Each structure stands twice: as structure tokens, then as C-alpha cells.
Amino acid sequence: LTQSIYNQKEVTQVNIPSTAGELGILANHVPTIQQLKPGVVEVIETNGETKSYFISGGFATVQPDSELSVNSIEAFQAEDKSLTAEAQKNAQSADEAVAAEAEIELEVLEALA
Amino acid sequence: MQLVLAGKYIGAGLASIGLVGAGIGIAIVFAALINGVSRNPALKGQLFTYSILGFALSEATGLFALMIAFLLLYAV
Amino acid sequence: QLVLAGKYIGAGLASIGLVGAGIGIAIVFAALINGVSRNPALKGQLFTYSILGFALSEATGLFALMIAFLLLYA
Amino acid sequence: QLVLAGKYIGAGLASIGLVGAGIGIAIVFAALINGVSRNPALKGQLFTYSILGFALSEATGLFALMIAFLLLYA
Amino acid sequence: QLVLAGKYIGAGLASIGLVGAGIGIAIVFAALINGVSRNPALKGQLFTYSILGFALSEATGLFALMIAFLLLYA
Amino acid sequence: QLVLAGKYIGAGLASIGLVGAGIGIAIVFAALINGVSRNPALKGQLFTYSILGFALSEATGLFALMIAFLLLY
Amino acid sequence: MQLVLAGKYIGAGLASIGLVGAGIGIAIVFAALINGVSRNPALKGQLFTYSILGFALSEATGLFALMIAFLLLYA
Amino acid sequence: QLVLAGKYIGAGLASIGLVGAGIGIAIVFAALINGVSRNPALKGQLFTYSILGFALSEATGLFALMIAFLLL
Amino acid sequence: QLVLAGKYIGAGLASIGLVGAGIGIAIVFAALINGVSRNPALKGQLFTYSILGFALSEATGLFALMIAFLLLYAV
Amino acid sequence: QLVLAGKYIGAGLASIGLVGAGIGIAIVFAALINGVSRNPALKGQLFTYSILGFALSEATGLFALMIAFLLLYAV
Amino acid sequence: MQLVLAGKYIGAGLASIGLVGAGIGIAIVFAALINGVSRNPALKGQLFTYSILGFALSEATGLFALMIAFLLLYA
Amino acid sequence: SFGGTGKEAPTFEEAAHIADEILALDTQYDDIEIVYNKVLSGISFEPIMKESYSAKAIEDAPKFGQYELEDDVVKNLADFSLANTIYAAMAEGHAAEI
């Protein structure tokens, strides 16, 4: 990604917001892979240390190695909007030129946290 | 009226076989409620008011079957 | 008695035809919950198809309940 | 007396042939929800097939309900 | 009279043999809806197999409706 | 009398076996339509394989239809 | 009075056929629970409150078919 | 009379055992297409297993038909 | 004689309710095998849930066995 | 005579228990094709587990054929 | 007494229908076994023990319908 | 063929502006191979030919059954990997240039 955060050393606990619904991959999980949707992502170290990230797309390749892989475009902490309110209204109102650009930019703001 | 009472009791037990549709039914509703929330959890408060809707509609069907069964015992 | 036996046995066998409406409404609401959970933006349109799917499934059971009411009171 | 009994026994027994029309219409509209929730652009097309799906499904159940009426009259 | 009592009870039990047509025709437009949903450009082919498939399941429903009419007027 | 009445009741019970054939013939296209949709380049084989699918299910439905007719005539 | 009591014991056996819907019912609820926790273990404490509400309403239908058989036995 | 009538009622009751062959044999054909559609290279193998799944499920239907014709 | 026959016929009709337990227990364990497969990290939790769910589906078949045992041994 | 009639009726009612075998055999083979199509490298293994489930379901299918054979010729 | 003995054999054939739940039940266990052993072909020793545990309690519901069937023939 | 690629360090937005154009012309090839330059210790460049699997090839795999995609789109797996091979080729070949 534009940033690189996680090594592949130790098994950890992570949740994923998939297109088949928000799931959870722990330990020797089945190589279940499908595209993720722009939403919140919860990551927790051992003993319950609270962390968080964000995802704007990509898959989550899993192999019987007890280690999860995740790729996206955005990967920052949650701590890191009047212009978006106009960009949201400007997306709601689109003419005959392909609207598709309008709807997609609002599905990433559905998290809003 | 010996055959009358005997008919009131066999048909009443046959009127309880219609409770299978409600027994399987309510399960299928809550099956999708679990298998739907387990996917997208943010739709919890939404699908829960819709799992409580299909339940009362399927439970009322078994109520119709239980109505006939309770009518043959105490009425006509 | 033999006249009254057919009114009671058959009317109890009439609610056995209510299994389809009991499972039916569920399958509609099941795919409804299973479908809206996958695409929440289509919920309003799927509801007009779920209410329609439940009413027609209930109607087949109301036909069985109607025969049960007749034998006793007709 | 014995004939009139059998008319009403099979009257409620013919209403059991409505289970298939109960679960049936559901499966049509359940697949409609399970099919539309995946592809929204195919609503008006599959909606004409969902009507054709439930109509042929309930018409069968009406044939079983038809016998129940034929047993009551003649 | 004992003979006629068996013509009208068995006719009510012969209509339940059509339940499979109520669920079977549902599976047509359940697979058809689920078939068009997987690929919209296959509506011309799969719909011909749906009309063919539903006609095969409905053909067995007439057989249960045939014996029931052979037990009423034949 | 009772022989004639039982020969009519058993015929009405033999037609219940058409539900299995009514569902047996059904489930066949549930994979045909859903199999061609996933891969249209196999319609030539999936159709031939689905011909014997309902044929064997029709045979089980033509056996109960045979018994009921043996009790009618 | 020998036939009235005989029909009392026949319908009570037919009233226990309604327990099939509760047997398959409770299974379907816990089937979604096991298949729901396996996909999303984070919703364990949430679906567990729906798995209780699920089978309790499905078993209640079987308690009605069980209620009739006892009314045909001792009443 | 009572013997002959019980033979005719019991014969129609023994034909209900063919319902299990209906749903049964159909699943073997349904899983077949569902299994070949996902992998067309496994046609020659699973076709020899679909016949096995039908003949053993059809032989049970002959036993249900045998009892029906032992009463007739 | 007429009562004793109604006790025996209905006793076999009361064993029809065991079908709901046969298909029921299967679906629970089928969800267990399918659930443990998709995530073998919760076998200690899915076993605690499968047994807790199985003990409720066998109860319905137990009631159908109870009435079947009650009929032939009740007055 | 009235016993012989009940022996004939009960024989046809005992063959209804073969439905669980007819549907049952298929559901096992439904996973046999499913298991091979999802992973063709498990044909020699899962085929032994597909006949295993077939035989256990067919073993209980003999009982519905055994009881029906006891009513027409054994007694 | 012929009516009692007839109803004894009638209920004996109606009690064998309860084996259907075990016939389909044992199948669904292998329907998920071969499925799960093929979906995640890495754990056979774990899921195989739950497949025997499931079919045993599923066949036990059929043995109860077999128990009643024997009590309605020689008791 | 577009010019104006290497004015600075290439970004991801310019990869989708050329990768989708490969899919915009025609589908055609199922044997797409990318040619870039490997770099080790910055001593010299390396002439090789890397390969990018295609949808038909991706699905036709002898040992693919270990994955359990929920019957979703397998076509986007190639376009996501192809547009990321280019970004992996416009970075190691951008180091053999320096």
C-alpha cells in the first residue's frame, strides 16, 4: 500500500468488512477470499490491545499458513466535512453524463467514523 | 353420540399436525436473521423488526390450526 | 353421529394444509432478511415483493382454513 | 348418511393439497428477493416471471381446492 | 352407500398428490430467476427450459387430478 | 361393496406418490438452469444429462399411477 | 364408552406428529448460529441472544401439539 | 371382503414409498450438474458415481413397489 | 378390546414424532461440521453450542417417545 | 381375517419408512460430487466415506423392509 | 381379540415410519462431512469423530422407533 | 501507447489509467506477460519476462480447490493483480533507471 504497517510474524485477531458481510478471520481459517467494502476495520493485538484501520477496497488472501494478508489503498489510524456535505449533495444531483462516479464516493463515507 | 366424541378427538389431534408449518417456519425466519446479521451486523436494528414481522405472520397460521384443535374439544 | 363425524374429522384434517402457509411466509421473510442483509439499498423495493409474496402464500392456507370453518357451521 | 360423511372427510383432505401452493408461491418470491437483491437492474423483467411463477404454482393448489368444492356439491 | 363413501374420501386424498406441482413449479421460476440473475444475456435459452421444465412437473399434477375425476364421475 | 370402496381409497392413496415425482422432475432443472447460467458452454451436455434426470423420476411416478389404475379397473 | 376412550388414545398419537416441526425447527435456529459464529465470531454475544429467542418460539409450537395430546389422555 | 379390501388399501399405501425415490434420484442429478458446471473436466468420473447414486436409490423403490404387488 | 387397539395404533403414530429429532440432530451436527470446517479455531466453542442445541432437538423426540410409552401404560 | 387385513394394511404402512433411505442415499452422494468438484485430489478418500454414509442409511432402510416382511409371511 | 391383534400390527407398521428421520438424518451428517473434509482438506481426524457422534444420536432416534415397533409385535 | 509516464515517482492513479485501457481495447489474450527490469544492489539492470495470469488460466488451476471464494466474481481477481503488476513493474524498473 501507500503505507506499510504489518509484518507476517505472529498470528493476531482481525475483522474484515467483506462484500458477503463483515466477517472474522482467526488462526487456521479457511482460505475464504472475496472483495471487501469501504468500512471500518478492527484490529486487536494480544491481551486485548485496541487498534483500528480503514479500507477502501481490495481482497484478503488467505493460505493454510495461519497468517492473514490484506491489501488496500488507504491504511491509516481512525484518528487520522462541510466540503463532503456539498460533494454528497453534488453526487445526489447528476445529469445524463455517467452518474456512477457520484454514488460510489458516498459509499466510502457510510462509515463516517 | 359415541362416534361424535370419538370424531371430536381424532380430528383434534389431526388439527395439531398443522403446527409443523409454524414450527419449521419461525426457525427459517430466525435462521436468516442470524445468517443475515452474522454477515452485515450494522443491519441489526433493521432486520430485527422484520424477523419479528414474519414470525407473527407464521405463528398466526399455527394459531389457526390450534384454533380448530381447541374448538373440537370444548365446542360443537 | 356418522353425519357429525365427517364434520369433525375432515375439519381437523383441513389445518394440515396450513403447513405450506406456515413454512411459506417464512421462506419469503427468510430470503427477505437474507437478501436485504446483502444489499440494504434495495430494501424498500424488496418489501413490496415480500408483502406480496406472503399474502399469496397465506391465501393458499386461508383456503384450507375456509373449508375447516364450513364443515362445522354449514 | 355414510355418503355425506365421506364428502366432508375428503373436503378437508383436499385442503391438504394447498401446502404445495403455500411453500410454492414463497419459493418464487423468495428467489425473487434472492435474485433481485443481487442484481437490481433485473426487477421489471423477473417481476413478470415471479407473477408467472406464483400463478402456475397457486393454480395447481386451486385445482386441489376445486375438488374440495366438487366434493361438497356433487 | 359404502362404495360412495370411498369415492369422496379417496378423491380428497388424491388431490394431495398434486402438492409436488405447487412446489415443483416454484422451483422452475426459482432456478429461472436464479438463472437469469447469474447471467442476464441467457434469458432466451433458459426461459425455454423453464417452460419445458414446468410442463413436465405440471404433467404429473394432472395425473393426480385425473384419478380424482375418475373417482367422481367415472 | 367394501371391496369396491377399498379399491377406490387405495387408488386415491397411490396418487400421493406423484408428489415425489412432482418434486423429482422439479429438482432436475434447478441444476440445469443454474448450471447453464454459471457456464453456458456446457449446455449441450447438461441438457442430455437432464433428460434422463426427469425420465427416471417420471418412471417412479408412472409406477404409482399404474397401481391406482389397477385399483380403478 | 369404549370407542370414545379409544378415539382419545388415537388422536393423542396423532397430536404428537406436530412435534416434528419443533424438532427440525430448533435445529435450523442453531444451524444458523453455528454457521453464523463460524463466519463472524465477533457477533457471538449478539447472535446468542437471538438463538435463544429463535428456538423458544419454535419449540412453543411443539408445546401446543403436546398440550392437546395430554387433553386427549387425561381429559 | 375385509381381506381383499385391505389388499387394495395397503397397495396404495405401499406406493407412497416411491416419494423418497423422487426427491432422492433428483438430488443425484442436481448435484451432478452442479458438480460438472463448476469443473467440466470431471465429467467421466462423476458420471460413473451418479449412476451408482441412482441405482442404489432406485432399488429401494423396487422394494417399496414389491410390497405393493405382494398385496395385489 | 376396542380401547387396547387404540392404545397400540396411536403408539405407532406417536413414534412418527421421532422424525423431527432424526433430521434435527443432523442439521445441528451438519452445521457443526460445516462450521468447524470454515473456522477450526472455535471447536471448543462450537462443541459447547452444538451440544446445547442438540439437547433441545432431542427433547422433542423424547416427548413423542413419552406419549408413545404413555399410551400403552395409562389406565 | 380382521388380523389378516391389519397384516396387509400395516405392511403397506411399513414401506413408507423407505422414504428416508431414498432421499438419504442421494444427500450423501450430493456431497460426494460436491467433495470431488471442490477438490478432485480427494476421490480415493471421500468415496469410502460416501459409501460409508450410504451403507449406514441403507442399513436402517432394511428395517422398514424387515417389519413389512414380518407382517405378510412371518406371522 | 382379533381387533387388538390387528391394531397391534397396524401400529407396528405406523411405528416404522419414524425411521425416516434417521434415514435422512445420517445422510445430512455425511453431506457436511464430505463437504467439510473437502472444503478445508486439512483436518479429517477432528470432523470424522463428530460425524460418528452425529449419526449415532441420529440413528438412536430410529432405534427408539425400532424399540416401539418391537413392543407392538411381541408385547 | 501514452507518453508522459516518468516525470516523477509514478503513483497508483496512473496505473488504472493504462491498465483499464488494456481491457478497453479488446479482451483477446489469455497469456499476458509483463517485461520489466530487476535490480539488485544497484549494480546493473536485469532483462527478464514476468507473467501475469489470466481469468481463464486463473480458474483452470490443478490445485485451486483449497480456496473457498463464495461464488463471487473471479474476473476481478485478474484485473486487481494485473493493475498491481504494472505498479510493481513501474517501481522496480523505476529503480533500475536510477
Residue numbers in the entry:
A (entry chain H): 15 to 94, 101 to 133
B (entry chain Q): 1 to 76
C (entry chain R), D (entry chain S), E (entry chain T): 2 to 75
F (entry chain K): 2 to 74
G (entry chain P), K (entry chain N): 1 to 75
H (entry chain L): 2 to 73
I (entry chain O), J (entry chain M): 2 to 76
L (entry chain G): 148 to 245
From the article:
Crystals of the YLF1c10 subcomplex were obtained from the 1YLF1Fo complex. Whereas previous crystallographic studies of similar complexes (Giraud et al., 2012, Pagadala et al., 2011, Stock et al., 1999) used an excess of nucleotide substrates or inhibitors to trap functional states, we crystallized YLF1c10 without any such additives to ensure similar conditions for crystallography and cryo-EM. The 3.5 Å X-ray structure of YLF1c10 reveals that all three non-catalytic α subunits bind Mg·ATP in their nucleotide sites. Of the three catalytic β subunits, one is empty (βE), while both the βDP and βTP sites (Abrahams et al., 1994) contain Mg·ADP. A detailed comparison of the YLF1c10 crystal structure to the bovine (Abrahams et al., 1994) and Saccharomyces cerevisiae (Kabaleeswaran et al., 2006) F1 and F1c10 complexes reveals that the three conformational states of the corresponding α/β heterodimers are very similar in the two yeast species, with root-mean-square deviation (RMSD) values below 1.7 Å, while nucleotide binding and C-terminal regions of the bovine β subunits differ. In YLF1c10 both the βE and the βDP site are more open than in the bovine complex, while their βTP sites are similar. Aligning the γ subunits in all F1 X-ray structures and comparing the relative positions of the conserved P loop in the βDP subunit, we find that the YLF1c10 P loop is shifted to a position that, in bovine F1 (Rees et al., 2012), would indicate a post-hydrolysis or pre-product release state. The post-hydrolysis position of the γ subunit in YLF1c10 agrees with the presence of bound Mg·ADP in the catalytic βDP and βTP sites. Since YLF1c10 was crystallized without added nucleotides, the ADP originates from ATP hydrolysis during isolation or crystallization (Abrahams et al., 1996, Gledhill et al., 2007). We found the inhibitor protein IF1 bound to one of the three different rotational F1 states in the cryo-EM maps, but not in the YLF1c10 X-ray structure, indicating that it was lost during crystallization.
The mitochondrial F1Fo-ATP synthase produces most of the ATP in the cell by rotary catalysis and plays a crucial role in severe human neurodegenerative disorders (Kucharczyk et al., 2009). The proton motive force (pmf) across the inner membrane drives the c-ring rotor in the membrane-embedded Fo subcomplex, generating the torque that powers a sequence of conformational changes in the membrane-extrinsic F1 subcomplex, resulting in ATP generation (Abrahams et al., 1994, Boyer, 1997, Noji et al., 1997). The Fo subcomplex is connected to F1 by the central stalk, which transmits torque to the catalytic head, and the peripheral stalk, which acts as a stator to prevent idle rotation of the F1 head with the c-ring. We determined the structure of a complete, dimeric F1Fo-ATP synthase from yeast Yarrowia lipolytica mitochondria by a combination of cryo-EM and X-ray crystallography.
